[PDB]
Subunit: 322 residues, 4 copies
């Protein structure tokens, strides 16, 4: 399996130059399942894990770029906070999960990597146990080659979006988007609608015609040199957190607030932000260019800064010891 | 256990039989990636997007006294939803039926919970995102009978609350009209019902119409007529059976919007699901429905439902063990 | 009167009004008195104003015939019951006063409004509902078109709002006819801004609700459907379903999803104020061939014929 | 006119005599450019402010002869009118002059004051073109209206969350622009009355607190104040409450308040022009804290009433 793919020449996005030693069976991808390190290709879970049958779980995703894992501490904090709200117990400390995660990456030998930690309600002594008190919660962790929500070419030159005609985001009182979850029924439906409409992605609205988020990303808009991102029906994203910190360092006002359907359509810039590929300019909405139809200046400034962070020793990154 | 206690003399009784545990299939079978496995060995790829995106549909049938109930109706529903999700099981209705009946026959269970699941599946590499590159998977299993409500509550009734904090996901979000594993709202509602000391929750939709419950449809009776939600609810096969029973009894039955006012004013409320049948709901938010005991229409339909499992006819098929 | 298309099924009556009557052209009945429409005034302290605490119905008169007045009175009084309003008159008394307004107006084509408000007490600013006297206001004025005659015959255009949805049955309930048009007014402004004839609003689950002053019906594969939930139970819709049945056309009150609206073979607006309006395009996309559909035309032409045919649906005003 | 208030409480009507030889005594409306006695105030049945409730308004109170925050009221009224494409055809200063004259002619020292801007009517009844409708301004000053009785202001009221009704969302009948469209509020009030409660607190579509029938809701938890930011009127009483909270060193946030946070609150209060700050002792029959007015609610309520007598920029004495 490829550990690299093309990125625009000279751009802020470049994979590491290195060779993996495939004499190790862990080379290229690792999972940690029921306390054992496995080749990613061998990684299997009980079909009776209620994380399958009820999607009764939470998770987080972190990236590794140039051998640096990005904000793992913040990822573990959000994961464990969510698990606590779901009455889940990983049975491992934050530092224990940090060491297991870093070991997955190290065994993979991947310098660019998509890293998942999942906590499930789990399974009991026999299949089809339904008393939560009898289910042993499971931790599953994996590190695999880098995943792009949008290809490198779109990270640099922009993607396109539609607002679905047929779908809205599940609200915080249904399948709660503020706890990261695998329940993508609405997100999958929106993505199918964007693909059918020839667009790169979908931006979903909440029940009150406020911007929610997209399938695997938060949305930020810029209007009159100010940045806004949805406060209610949206994951509290760590990329969004990073974007707000960059904006403050640049003297750009950044508010978490309701962004109405009016404000989305009237935006000077629209961007997608996510762990899986960073900051994506959205050049077009429902076939209408935003600004001049190319990546906006705040979006370009913040994106370029984001990728620079992956090479600057400091609290946001930790070097994997390969 | 292949059995649990049921109220003595009640319409609910497990079969009296011995399983041969020399078979590694005894008590539980799964069919995964084209192979029959002991249930305890049944594992799937972590990279199946049926896990990472819950991108799948399923159905559940029951086996009672060695008889599988409305399997053809379950496969029709399963395959119709799969077509709506752009999934392809890569097996015919008849092929899935044979594989399903073989899982039960190998389990040796006369009372069984039978699941068929169709997932978007996995590509050649973990982290394939391109749907055209994902090979859809079928997983089938037959395990001991599962009760959405204990047998004691099937006969004596359960208690319900309407969540203060949760609503059922709408058909335009995580669509409840296609059976799915995305129980975020249903799990939250169950925890609230448990926190309040109730047997279960009845969730409303965005317009304060009844949706359904965690693993069941709701039916009400008012002035001798039955009604069940049409919009934000699974089209249940137990509900289908209940409407047929009602028809045969001369009782009008409508699939329609049931408002919050109508739920609270109901003469009777009942839960209906594959996993345990027809459950009387005695109280709603601590207020007795009728006299706070199983209603007369509910009892008549529940008892008729169980009688169907022993009557030769087109709704049942005997597993040939 | 105003222009209608030459030779079409819509034609005003040929007659002259005697303007020696101060009632000629418009009559209201307010606080037990018939008045010229030009003089019809209500107390500002009617809570029908300050809380929009009221229901109403609208009937039309065409060629001197009032259409389904009994059904209109039934619907008005049923909603007034749900609102705990009491008009303090019987159905037959209201029917007599209604026909008298039309007669005094001399209008052969007329828009007829019956409103029941929560009313006012002895003191402005009375808030105790038990101390408010409910009020009945009735008027008959020249015919009002939700769509012009030209659009009745040749069709209009619609958009689905980007920014607005219909209030649900559990908020400001559309199943009880009301003056609370905040959403409908926002949707109409959005359609105007977007160069469209009108708006079709969605409910919270992306099911068709209705439009600003009309129900929506679709045709798909020769079958008619109209929303069952977040929509007024229209008397034009009731008529359309009776016409469809008599034509051998299957007609269902059910949820119509956003998918089914956009995929429809035909779309129509139905309302008392102008009848059955073909909708040629939705968000700029032609419905069928972008001209009034065959079911829509058959039902619209039948609807206008019902106005002139003696029977239970019509009663001739005695002028 | 006055009614009983609790003896020695922070709420007391003025002691004074109206001269009823003026026909304006006790109540005045300003309709179609004419000052009228309230009893004679009538509007065209064809104003689309009636038939479409196509209007906005605001309500100010007069207490001890002082009108409270009229400029804020006028700013909020006119901002909402611009959003509705309404034009009063009067300046903020002209509307202020007309408002204060209604109060002066009424002789009321305690008054409920309404300013309404409607889409209006055309030359013909039933005119269908908005561009041909002349927008109307209607203003009145009448005796003080209480959302909750003085006894409840001092000793607290009770509330329920409706089983059957929710607040209309900002994308339907928008609660962020003051309106007469009370269909949900009226239904909620009927359900509270059926359940024997003082009032209803409505939720939005996501089970966040919206507001009540004529008031904003504020909660206190762990000594901090919160009030809904989305589906709720931007109240001037709420604005005052937040200024009073800041002055007292009490953290106050406009934010989503979940249904969890409402039921878990240490204090709940109703805030509105028509009676001020009302303690809510009980929710769905369960005591909030000890089932008596909470300490933050009492300190803010008493401060709010003291404001009506302190010379300062929030009040203007009516020159009778
Ligand atoms: O592209 C995606 C979806 O795959 C990213 O948003 C990321 O993967 C998410 O964290 C989990 O899938
Ligand atoms: O997981 C379950 C069992 O709890 C459900 O999928 C199943 O449908 C059952 O019919 C209701 O419990
Ligand atoms: O039938 C009606 C009654 O309201 C509406 O269609 C009418 O057109 C509206 O009152 C004016 O637009
Ligand atoms: O300001 C208010 C809110 O109280 C008034 O709009 C209302 O008419 C009356 O108080 C409600 O009963």
């Amino acid at each position: 399996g490829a550990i690299r793919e093309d990125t625009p020449a000279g751009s802020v996005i470049q994979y590491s130059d290195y060779e993996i030693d495939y004499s190790s069976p862990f080379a290229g991808g690792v999972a940690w399942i029921e306390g054992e390190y496995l080749p990613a290709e061998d990684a299997k879970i009980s079909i009776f894990d209620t994380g399958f049958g009820k999607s009764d779980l939470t998770y987080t995703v972190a990236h590794v770029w140039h051998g640096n894992i990005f904000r793992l501490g913040d990822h573990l904090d959000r994961l464990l906070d969510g698990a606590r709200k779901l009455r889940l117990d990983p049975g491992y400390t934050k530092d224990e999960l940090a060491d297991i995660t870093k070991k997955c990456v190290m065994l993979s030998q991947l310098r660019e990597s998509f890293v998942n930690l999942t906590i499930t309600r789990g399974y009991g002594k026999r299949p089809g146990e339904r008393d939560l008190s009898k289910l042993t919660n499971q931790v599953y962790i994996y590190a695999i080659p880098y995943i792009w929500a949008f290809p490198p070419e779109e990270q640099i030159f922009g993607t396109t979006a539609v607002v679905p005609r047929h779908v809205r985001r599940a609200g915080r009182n249904t399948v709660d988007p503020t706890i990261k979850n695998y329940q993508w029924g609405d997100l999958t439906a929106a993505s199918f609608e964007a693909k059918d409409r020839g667009a790169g992605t979908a931006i979903l609205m909440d029940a009150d015609n406020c911007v929610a988020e997209g399938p695997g990303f938060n949305v930020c808009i810029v209007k009159d040199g100010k940045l806004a991102s949805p406060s209610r029906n949206a994951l509290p994203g760590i990329t969004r957190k990073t974007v707000f910190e960059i904006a403050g360092a640049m003297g750009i006002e950044a508010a978490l607030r309701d962004v109405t359907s009016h404000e989305l359509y009237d935006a000077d810039e629209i961007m997608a932000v996510t762990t899986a590929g960073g900051v994506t300019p959205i050049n077009t909405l429902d076939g209408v260019p935003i600004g001049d139809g190319e990546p906006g200046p705040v979006t370009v400034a913040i994106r370029d800064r984001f990728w620079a962070l992956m090479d600057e020793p400091g609290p946001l990154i930790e070097a994997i010891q390969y």
